[PDB]
Amino acid sequence: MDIDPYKEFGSSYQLLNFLPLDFFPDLNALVDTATALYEEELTGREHCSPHHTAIRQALVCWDELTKLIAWMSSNITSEQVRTIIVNHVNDTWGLKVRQSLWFHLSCLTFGQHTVQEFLVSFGVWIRTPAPARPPNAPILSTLP
Amino acid sequence: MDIDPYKEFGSSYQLLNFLPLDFFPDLNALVDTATALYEEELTGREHCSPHHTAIRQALVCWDELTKLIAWMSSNITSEQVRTIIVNHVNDTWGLKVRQSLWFHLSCLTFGQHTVQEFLVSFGVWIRTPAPARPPNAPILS
Numbered sequence A: 001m002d003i004d005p006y007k008e009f010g011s012s013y014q015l016l017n018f019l020p021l022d023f024f025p026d027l028n029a030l031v032d033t034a035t036a037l038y039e040e041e042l043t044g045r046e047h048c049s050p051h052h053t054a055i056r057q058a059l060v061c062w063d064e065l066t067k068l069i070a071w072m073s074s075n076i077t078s079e080q081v082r083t084i085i086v087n088h089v090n091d092t093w094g095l096k097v098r099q100s101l102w103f104h105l106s107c108l109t110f111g112q113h114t115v116q117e118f119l120v121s122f123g124v125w126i127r128t129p130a131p132a133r134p135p136n137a138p139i140l141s142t143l144p
Numbered sequence B: 001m002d003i004d005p006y007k008e009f010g011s012s013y014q015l016l017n018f019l020p021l022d023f024f025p026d027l028n029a030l031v032d033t034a035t036a037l038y039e040e041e042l043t044g045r046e047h048c049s050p051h052h053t054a055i056r057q058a059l060v061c062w063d064e065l066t067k068l069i070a071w072m073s074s075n076i077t078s079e080q081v082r083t084i085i086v087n088h089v090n091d092t093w094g095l096k097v098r099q100s101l102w103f104h105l106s107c108l109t110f111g112q113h114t115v116q117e118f119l120v121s122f123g124v125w126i127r128t129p130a131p132a133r134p135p136n137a138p139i140l141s
Helices: A027-042 A050-075 A079-091 A093-110 A112-127 B027-042 B050-075 B079-110 B112-127
Strands: none
Touching (some): A079 A093, A093 B050, B027 B050, B027 B079
């Protein structure tokens, strides 16, 4: 199936992918934010919100990934080849986990609607030709 | 952070890990079932249920894994070290994806309380010693 994990959240993948890669905080910061703001809720017994569910699924996935690269690291793969695997991972999969954590943590903190409206505004802006294009990007708050 | 993706669903990794590995259907089978029974809901605009959110997340995760295996397969890795890797993620990561798909698809078609009670009954079963232990496992109905 063709599944966009942002579609049930009123956004889309291509909208997340318009933003510059440096826009999203690094992963460690996002986990620190998630821990500090929602640790009890995410490790709790209740759904809380589909955003919480997305966060836990994404962190669980990322955990499987780090255990995989740890396994092939200590078990099979040499040093340099390990570092190119890890660098490809962080340049791809890690970006996607950061996009997810940023999206859902931002929805929980500032409201899903204002995040949706930000992403849509940014899409409009990046899609506008330079003659008609306003100088300044749409903006949205940043997380702790 | 220490997260059990089943605790939000009133269950437990530990209960899933009691079941034998061959109990969960092949992943192609679970994906076929999710496609046939839930394609339009899963690929839609609405959450539908936490089970749907979990299934889309699980399959998106598995997709990222297949693309990683593809990349390091054709770029980095010899055929035999590749198959060792594919064996590892199949017996580990893949088993876990099958566990997630089976759990949530089972909740959707058969009820969440039904699946919960099944897992707790199976836990009780696998836990009781052979003298007092009934001969036939709990079923899911």
